[PDB]
Amino acid sequence: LTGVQNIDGKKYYFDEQGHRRRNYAGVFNNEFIYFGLDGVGQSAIEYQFEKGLTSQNSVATSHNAAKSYDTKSFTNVDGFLTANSWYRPTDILRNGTKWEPSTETDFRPLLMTWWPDKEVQANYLNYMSALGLGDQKIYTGASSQLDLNNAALIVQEAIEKKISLEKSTKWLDDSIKSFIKSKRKDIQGNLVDTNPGWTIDSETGSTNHLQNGAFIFTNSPLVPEANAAEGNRLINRTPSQQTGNHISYASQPYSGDDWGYELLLGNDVDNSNPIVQAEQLNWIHYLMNFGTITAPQDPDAHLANFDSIRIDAVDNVDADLLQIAGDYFKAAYQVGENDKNANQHIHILQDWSPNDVWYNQQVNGNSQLTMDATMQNQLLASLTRPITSRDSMKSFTKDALLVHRTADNSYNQAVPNYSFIRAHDSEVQTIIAKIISDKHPDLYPTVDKALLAKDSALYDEAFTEYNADMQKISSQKQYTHNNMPSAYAILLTNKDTVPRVYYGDLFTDNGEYMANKTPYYDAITSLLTARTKFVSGGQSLSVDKNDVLTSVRYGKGALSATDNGSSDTRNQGIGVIVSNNPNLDLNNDKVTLSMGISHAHQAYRPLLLTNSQGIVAYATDSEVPQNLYKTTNDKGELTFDASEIKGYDTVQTSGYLAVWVPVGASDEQDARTIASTEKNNGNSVYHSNAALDSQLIYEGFSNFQTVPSKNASADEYANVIIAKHAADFNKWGVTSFQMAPQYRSSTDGSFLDAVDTVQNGYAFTDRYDLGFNAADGSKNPTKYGTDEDLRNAIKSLHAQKTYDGSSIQVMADFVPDQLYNMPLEQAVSVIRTDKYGVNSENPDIQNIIYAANIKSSGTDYQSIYGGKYLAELQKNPLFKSLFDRIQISTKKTIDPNTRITQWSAKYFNGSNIQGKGINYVLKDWASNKYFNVSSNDDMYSRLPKQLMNQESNTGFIVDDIGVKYYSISGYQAKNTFVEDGNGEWYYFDNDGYMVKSTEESGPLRTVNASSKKYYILPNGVEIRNSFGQDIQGNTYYFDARGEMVTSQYISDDTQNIYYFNNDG
Ligand SMILES: OC[C@H]1O[C@H](OC[C@H]2O[C@H](OC[C@H]3O[C@H](OC[C@H]4O[C@H](O)[C@H](O)[C@@H](O)[C@@H]4O)[C@H](O)[C@@H](O)[C@@H]3O)[C@H](O)[C@@H](O)[C@@H]2O)[C@H](O)[C@@H](O)[C@@H]1O
């Protein structure tokens, strides 16, 4: 059978293929039929909407009309209304039994007396009915307007009685907010959001962001105060892309890739805005003078200042900031003059992209130290990986390493760098999340998915496993790093690098600060003090035929194996042996430590050695038994037998580790070198040399440190423990103490940093608040301590003095990228995007108005200190070059003339998706304009006419000329689409009349001079997800938006494909 058929008094269409069709329109045997989803024909002549209007004027609309139309009587966001708007009516139905004038505090939720369409009204009624206040009747969007209105009166009676009983409306804010986010069962049987336009479910777009979605803020004439200047909101200005275009600075062996992207986390700060760039400078000046600024009455306030900064998230922010900072330290502390001044202020980059190393060198001029990621990645791959996945030791002599150490024999050649093995983030968090995954596949089956979980009970569980696996032998380490002391032994003996030690190597990553040691503490703290006494001179790496790494330092004064050295050489210069093979069987093969010829016929003793029991550590010459002493031959070589070196499997080593030092060193002996005072002509601020290698960084925190409970004793707080243990860090050779960010944390759980169990300080609302006491004067700390406790930690570290007589530096975590959890809402124009700022191309969310949490309180410490010192600094001659500098990305100078005391949306690139819902800002569907109460401009819609006690009618009205529609608010449809409760779409033209196709002008129609073609029946029904037949017999398809498809193949329900060409 083909064509039109009556099967059981019902019309069906069978195509020319014989297939029964659904969602097909056409003129068949001179009759216009629409085969709906059923596959059943409906008459495309007969109107499908209930004809008629109902007045929204009631006996009660005179009373429930707003007393004042002005902002006073409406809660609002910059004049706009949201679903959580409350308003003051003229009268209150007090206790459900009398109309009384409203007082100044008699506000009620807008949603008690007005809804944006009938379906929301229906759902509200059934929900308030679930709480016992509403009627049993179960009204739907299908039920009549008049019934819904009367039911809202019965609900209102019940609300008012409850309010009179409580003498409070707080319970109603609670219940309406819960209604707005409510879920319900459906026909499918799955839970769905009741009100999708008011939840994250409507915020659909790209998932490529840490928080599953992003907005870019853009300008729009509806919102004057959130609009940025022209040439601001620059995106993705990484060091590689700072100019506007990617630039590889890398040469033949090395990569010049960029892994950056602007929108990382939170609310994204526009660091391309010159006023923001000035406020970033002001914040650095505040940190570098924190003591003198916060405790002016303390005579020692000048000892409680920070000395250096680490730049955080370098790949995510405008790279102009690196120059701004590098200028400040030249202006303030003359770091450009010589190594002596440079090395007193050691800054570091979190520069993960391979190109950044070379950007830093060529453009940056080394104002901050790059990380050696090639060293980190190689130490991990060759030793820490379990046996299956492990690289050969021979990889340490490869070409792709940043600093070749096989033949390093000179100063001022290597790129100045810091190298490390682990970070608060790097190689800690990922391991925990994998444990969560391997224990709970039901919640997070893929490893990446496990990262994101915030449950306190999930971390506690994952950590008892993590801690237990760290105690296991290397062959049974399922998650923890193997060979950790072997890695630290290479790192701490290497030349031309500033090593950084992670807190969580020495201590447990979780629990009380400094309270529990790792299995590695003895090995690593031995190496740290030994570095101070022996590690100096040139270096060489080798690997013998058995893959045994031998790293040698020749001692101060000697730069190669054939160098005779100075008087300092003899008792300096360590040698290290590492194997990564648990079954190493040397047999007849010999391992050789070739110390220098400067070290011929010389007694050596062990610092570290591997047993089956673990690693033995000898702290002095006299702790070594005399048979373990070994003397070098005439060439300066030590030789080892299978009786000494074999494969091991302990907690601390897969393979072998040994460290040998020359006998007879004094206790006065320090291997470190004083910084040069000679003037530096070079582009770089730092130089890789003996004085710089004398430095060492200690990352003094972990994410998963337990957070001192509300009534914690004074000595749980980490900054107090730091002050106690100040001498221990100096003993370890620490010259730069990298503290945690000290900023008051968010507790909201938008991210892992924002979790109340681990409030690390990277998630903050008020950058200037380092734990100042509360308003009442009660002590109110951060995770680490009060402002007092911080100032005292800084003084204790400053009181410690290193080998050159200078203080131990204290480093601030400089975090310019984002702000979290801002208190006030602002209207903003948004586009849905991914993390790169690429338009996710959602039609519904293009330049729409959103109520974003994006405005600071204006009573915070930002409001006190923000831009405060820019007036002072501009007047200082030393800072002239900073303020006159043309920045790379902006091509303008910094703008210190405006102060930022309240953050506003105009200073942000964008934000993560906040889950308010697209239609959270309220809007009349007929006029398609937003409500605004602060303005009577024509771009905004006036209040719904009922609320201003005017005549108001809603529904469809047939007329001698055509069909008009009025919304629930009482306004006429003009130049919009309108969905009926039946599910059908219609369109209304400029004249305010429904578009209907005619015999003379067929169903395929452009409507809005938009070049977009739709299919409209004689009903006025605009068909969607459907096929449309022409009078000529041509067939077109119309997508989910109703738009005609062109040059494209459409797939069908039954897997049938039709490919429609351009225009037809
Ligand atoms: O202030 C916000 C945060 O600041 C710090 O973190 C900043 C950086 O966070 C991430 O970097 C961590 C990540 O870096 C490397 O990831 C390697 C990946 O590189 C590519 O994409 C590659 O193609 C991938 O295969 C590979 O996985 C490290 O090796 C890894 O260990 C680290 O986890 C961002 O990605 C960076 O762009 C940011 O600059 C601070 O640590 C955070 O806690 C703060 O919240």
Ligand SMILES: [Ca+2]
């Ligand atoms: Ca940014």
